[PDB]
């Protein structure tokens, strides 16, 4: 099933403060107005293509969402990254520690790192075999469909993995929803207020006006 | 869709016939003109090196480029003044109004300054300022002329105007009340003063509306300052590109020059630093190069505003749609952000009537041509007129003159010349 | 001025000579509050790198060390550097260093370069065309070579496709090129994925074992965590000085400010696409780094032949940041300020002239825009003249330049 | 001081020249500013790479200028046309046009010649001793209005 | 129509788009100037049979 990518995925290209200025640059982004996916965050947790790199999105209760794992094969024949939370920190391995192939829980050390009302939005991309996270979460103003307007994720976490990623899919802990889309190469222009803040963007080939 | 060029019109010419206007309308169309645009100047060294003494020793290896750089740009800065001298100062007496505005019925009031303003500009004055909207060794120099300067000037041309008619651009100031000197700018476009007299407070109700009309335009129509604020926009988007092309990396392999000198060592720095020196230079030849080129804009604008200024306002112009459509009476210059705005009063005729004429009229044997007008009849009846507005004289040997017998004229009339 | 106008005659006017910059009293350093050594010498010191193939990384974080001893050891038989000199890396610092290490034989180590192609550079260890680092190499014949040949040192000889910017790929699948199957075992157009150089004593200089270390640098918007041997200084705060924050340096006033710097943001640029604030790395705070305050010098003279007198304004400088008078052009010093007001003889800006008068001194005043006349109007009189004089006016305008050539193969060659 | 506007355009195709000159000293990053020390020190192929920084230096310097003189020819050309409507009008003819030919009311010209210009003698009519009168726009006699 | 040289012309920064824009800006004066010479006329006037 499909929904729309309406304003969402934009995150700060950099760690720079850039204020009162219209900024451009060309990067990784999810194209706006474009088509994604949508599923029940149940059971409806396939493997998934990653791509050149993923928006995320779920729609959740309690985060029932719990981790992710990405990598070529998914299944501890290499090593592969996995994603968790243990309710204290988010918990990040490559181990060829073999989760579920039933993918969900019921409530090889080569890396390793330690740290529907919920809406939670995550953005990843591989770059030199770096993985790098940006999210934001917030309460939904909507029940099933994604947010039409516009917001900015925040920088988490940049991992000096050395991994290469073609596919991903995410785990449950059981006793909500989520949304898939990829990212493609736009030049995009962004809204730097004074107060050092990405405001709005435009993904200057979404139409000619956008151009 | 395929654009018109205009309603189309048969003009209903015939050998017989012509339309001579029995009203008018005193126009008053506004022109707006650029004097002198942003005043820069750019120390090329800072520019191009940043106090880098690195990138300053291979910069004097160019020679006398960044001083003909910053010398154009200081001809340019120097003739911005020169410019707003020429449109404005062309009185050398600074003139002030008269207390009591006695002007026959004409309405001033909102084109002369105001005294409640902090800064004394006219009420039109300062809507023209309402509607018009750099840290790396380029520099903005302000004008040598204050705002505050020339809203005098624009107050002693304007009070010259109203008080003295052409006679403060020729010679000293001379008194004339404002409804004659009316007559005599009426006179200087072919219409008997008397058409003035009997229709003074006619005149003055037009002329008040269409002062009272520019307001309106210029409150509700921002876009009317085009030219003007266009000036303002291209320098600006000019310095943003000159600013900007301090990010390009002109093939070293960073634009930031403390990089090339806190990661490279003095042998490789220089052939890095020598393309960023070429880029930044090539850039700022550029920019004054431009700067140049519309340097020459605004001073033909300048010359122009000048000429206009000395034509229109200083006099009445002969010259047709020089000083504003219809035939020019009179004008009045206000100012504006880089530029001036003359508010040109026409008379422009209205509400024809067609009449049979004729070239010539044949009395005792000889032909009679009108003095000065037209011979025209409203079908039975023969009169003559001045061209320009209808006022139908009996036809006698004073309004007329003798030339020759009545055979040689094509299409004279038989009619009785009276002698008083 | 005279030096400006390359003359020793000054005619009265006012020239652009220069420009006001308060100066770097002193240096300031500011790299992270770090210790510890970083472990390029126990790489250095290591029993065996693995088979190129599968290349070893060591990331460096949270550590200083001197590089400067390195490139002159007797224990390297190469050193190189890319995006960096080797002289320089004792003054800098760096988000992260990785270092990469193998054995191959000499005749390979040219492919450790930046944008290269053969057999490494595509199928073992590929670096980018912009590589920013270094490469430190040994010949190990000494350690790595034997009678009959050591063999356990190998390489990829052949992959299906070529490998990204440092992609890491250790399976050993077979290389099917043909119909062969490849079933596990060698065949014709199946050849196997690997070779050994096989490294025997008899083996030239070039073809000889050498042990290899790649120091892969970066300098990120994150903070440095790896440094050269120079210490921290204090800070000092709203004075001019010559700045190194991890090694982003220059001349300015480290300005406090309240810029709102999202939690994440460690620099901040002007639209110049250069830094104006930075977060110091041990004090947590938004250092504005203000320009040394700058401002063009204009000097206003009458001239040479009347005085040696002279009177200079600041352009956009207050008087208090530099008799003395505050124009809004800028600080106007050495000019006496006047209030009666007269023709303007030396332009400065914002309706202030200059002249020289009384014993004298330059003068700087209000210009006066013309002698203050009213017009005696009233709604029945006029004036009427009663005589004339006849002016004459000379009005002069140029008509044609000179005609110059020049023939621009006699200019630029001759 | 009065010929400024004569005196001033030999002076600055005098100083564009110069200055044009001096760039001939300017080392443009090559060994040496003089092209016979380049030929005279380096063989061939070393030669060429530091003449080449020479020229890329002297022919930027020429289109410096050459751009400079069209942009100067322009401004002169709308002098020369300026002049040769005064000619035109204010010589061959008497202006109507307010302080065009002159300040006051202009009579006639004559034109002299200078070097790289013309200078004009505008003759002018000025009004110069008031007297100040009561006035009207008419005056009524027999109860009809007589205008002048 | 090389991607190879066009990557390297990135580099020299805004000097095309302001080239584009000059030339731009002298084309479209072409079609004021032939206005202003000749649109001078409000209504198109035309003469009797
Ligand atoms: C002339 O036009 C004005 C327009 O306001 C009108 O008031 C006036 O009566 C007209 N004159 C004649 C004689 O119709
Ligand atoms: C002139 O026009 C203004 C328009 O606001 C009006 O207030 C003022 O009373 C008028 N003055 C005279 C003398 O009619
Ligand atoms: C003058 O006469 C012609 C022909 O009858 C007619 O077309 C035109 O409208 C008339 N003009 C006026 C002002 O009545
Ligand atoms: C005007 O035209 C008519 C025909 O329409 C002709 O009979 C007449 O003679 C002409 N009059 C003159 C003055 O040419
Ligand atoms: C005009 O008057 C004369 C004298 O009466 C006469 O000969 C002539 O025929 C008349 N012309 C016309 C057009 O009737
Ligand atoms: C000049 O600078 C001082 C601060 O040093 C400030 O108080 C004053 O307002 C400034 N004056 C002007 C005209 O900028
Ligand atoms: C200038 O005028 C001010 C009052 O406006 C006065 O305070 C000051 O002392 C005067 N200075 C001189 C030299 O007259
Ligand atoms: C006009 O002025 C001259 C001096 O310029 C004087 O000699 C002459 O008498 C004056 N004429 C009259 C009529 O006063
Ligand atoms: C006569 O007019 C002049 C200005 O033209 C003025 O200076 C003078 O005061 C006036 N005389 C009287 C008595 O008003």
Request: proline content about 5%; glycine content about 6%; aromatic content about 12%.
């Amino acid at each position: 099933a499909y929904t729309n990518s309406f304003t969402r995925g934009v995150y700060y290209p950099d760690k720079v403060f850039r204020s009162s200025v219209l900024h451009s640059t060309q990067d990784l982004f999810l194209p706006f107005f474009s088509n994604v996916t949508w599923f029940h965050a149940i059971h409806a947790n396939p493997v998934l293509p990653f791509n050149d790199g993923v928006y995320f999105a779920s729609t959740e209760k309690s985060n029932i969402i719990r981790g992710w794992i990405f990598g070529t094969t998914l299944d501890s024949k290499t090593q592969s990254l996995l994603i968790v939370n243990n309710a204290t920190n988010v918990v990040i391995k490559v181990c060829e520690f073999q989760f579920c192939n039933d993918p969900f829980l019921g409530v090889n050390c080569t890396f390793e790192y330690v740290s529907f009302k919920n809406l939670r939005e995550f953005v990843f991309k591989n770059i030199d075999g770096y993985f790098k996270i940006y999210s934001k979460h917030t309460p939904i103003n909507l029940v099933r469909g994604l947010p039409q307007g516009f917001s900015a994720l925040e920088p988490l976490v940049d991992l000096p993995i050395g991994i290469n990623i073609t596919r991903f899919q995410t785990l449950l802990a059981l006793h909500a929803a989520y949304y898939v889309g990829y990212l493609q190469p736009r030049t995009f222009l962004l809204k730097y207020n004074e107060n050092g803040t990405i405001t709005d963007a435009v993904d200057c080939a979404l139409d000619p006006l956008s151009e | 869709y395929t654009m018109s060029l205009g309603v189309e019109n048969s003009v209903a010419y015939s050998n017989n016939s012509i339309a001579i206007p029995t009203n008018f309308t005193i126009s008053v169309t506004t022109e707006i003109l650029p004097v002198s645009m942003t005043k820069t100047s750019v120390d090329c060294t800072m520019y191009i090196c940043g106090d880098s003494t690195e990138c300053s020793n291979l910069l004097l290896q160019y020679g006398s480029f960044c001083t003909q750089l910053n010398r154009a740009l200081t001809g340019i800065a120097v003739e911005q003044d020169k410019n707003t001298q020429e449109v404005f100062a062309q009185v050398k007496q600074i003139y002030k109004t008269p207390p009591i505005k006695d002007f026959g019925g004409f309405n001033f009031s909102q084109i002369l300054p105001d005294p409640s303003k902090p800064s004394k500009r006219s009420f039109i004055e300062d809507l023209l300022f309402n509607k018009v909207t750099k840290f790396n060794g380029l520099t903005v120099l302000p004008p040598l002329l204050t705002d505050e300067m020339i809203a005098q000037y624009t107050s002693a041309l304007l009070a010259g105007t109203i008080t003295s008619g052409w006679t403060f651009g020729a010679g000293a100031a001379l008194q004339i009340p404002f409804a004659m000197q009316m007559a005599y700018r009426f006179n200087g476009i072919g219409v008997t003063q008397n058409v003035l007299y009997e229709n003074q407070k006619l005149i003055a109700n037009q002329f008040n509306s269409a002062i009272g009309k520019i307001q309106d335009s210029l409150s509700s129509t921002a876009s009317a300052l085009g030219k003007l604020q266009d000036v303002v926009n291209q320098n600006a988007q000019a310095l943003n590109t000159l600013v900007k092309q301090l990010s390009s990396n002109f093939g070293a392999i960073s634009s930031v020059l403390n990089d090339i000198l806190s990661r490279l060592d003095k042998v490789e720095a220089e052939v890095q630093i020598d393309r960023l020196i070429t880029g930044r230079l090539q850039s700022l030849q550029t920019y004054v190069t431009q700067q140049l080129i519309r340097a020459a804009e605004i001073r033909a604008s300048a010359n122009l505003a000048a000429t206009k200024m000395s034509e229109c306002v200083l006099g009445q112009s002969k010259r047709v749609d020089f000083c504003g459509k219809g035939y020019h009476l009179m004008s009045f210059p206000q100012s504006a952000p880089h530029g001036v705005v003359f508010l040109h009063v026409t008379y422009v005729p209205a509400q024809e009537k067609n009449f049979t004429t004729a070239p010539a009229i044949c009395h005792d044997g000889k032909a009679h041509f009108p003095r000065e007008g037209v011979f025209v009849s409203n079908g039975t009846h023969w009169f003559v007129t001045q061209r320009n507005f209808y006022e139908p004289q009996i036809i006698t040997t004073d309004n007329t003159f003798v030339s020759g017998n009545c055979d040689v004229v094509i299409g004279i009339v038989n009619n009785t010349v009276y002698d008083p | 001025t005279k030096c400006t106008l390359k003359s020793f005659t000054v005619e009265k006017g006012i020239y652009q000579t220069s420009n006001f910059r308060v100066q770097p009293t002193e240096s300031i350093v500011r790299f992270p509050n770090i210790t510890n050594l970083c472990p390029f010498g126990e790489v250095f010191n290591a029993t065996r790198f693995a088979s190129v193939y599968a290349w070893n990384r060591k990331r460096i974080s949270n550590c200083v060390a001197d590089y400067s001893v390195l490139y002159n050891s007797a224990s390297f038989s190469t050193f190189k550097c890319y995006g960096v000199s080797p002289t320089k890396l004792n003054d800098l610092c760096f988000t992260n260093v990785y270092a990469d290490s193998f054995v191959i034989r000499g005749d390979e180590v040219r492919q450790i370069a930046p944008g290269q192609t053969g057999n490494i550079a595509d199928y073992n260890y590929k670096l980018p065309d912009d590589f920013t680092g270094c490469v430190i190499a040994w010949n190990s014949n000494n350690l790595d070579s034997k009678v009959g040949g050591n063999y356990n040192y190998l390489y990829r000889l052949f992959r299906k496709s070529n490998l990204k910017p440092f992609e890491r790929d250790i399976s050993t699948e077979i290389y099917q090129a043909g119909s062969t199957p490849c079933n596990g075992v060698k065949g014709f157009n199946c050849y196997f994925p690997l070779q050994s150089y096989g490294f025997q004593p008899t083996y030239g200089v070039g073809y000889q074992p050498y042990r290899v270390v790649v120091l892969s640098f970066e300098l990120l918007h994150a903070p440095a965590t790896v440094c050269g041997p120079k210490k921290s200084t204090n800070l000092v705060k709203n004075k001019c000085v010559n700045f190194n924050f991890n090694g982003l340096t220059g001349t300015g006033v480290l300005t406090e400010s309240n810029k709102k710097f999202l939690p994440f943001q460690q620099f901040g640029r002007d639209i110049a696409d250069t830094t104006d604030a930075v977060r110091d790395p041990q004090t947590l705070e938004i250092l504005d780094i203000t320009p040394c305050s700058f401002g063009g010098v204009s000097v206003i003279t009458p001239g040479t032949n009347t005085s040696n007198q002279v009177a200079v304004l600041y352009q956009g400088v207050n008087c208090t940041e530099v008799n003395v008078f505050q124009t809004r052009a800028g600080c106007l010093i050495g000019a006496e300020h006047v209030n009666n007001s007269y023709e303007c003889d030396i332009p400065i800006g914002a309706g202030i002239c200059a002249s020289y008068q009384t014993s004298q001194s330059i003068i700087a005043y209000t210009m006066s825009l013309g002698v203050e006349n009213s017009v005696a109007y009233s709604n029945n009189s006029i004036a009427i003249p009663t005589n004339f004089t006849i002016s004459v006016t000379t009005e002069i305008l140029p008509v044609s330049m000179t005609k110059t050539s020049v023939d621009c193969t006699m200019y630029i060659c001759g």
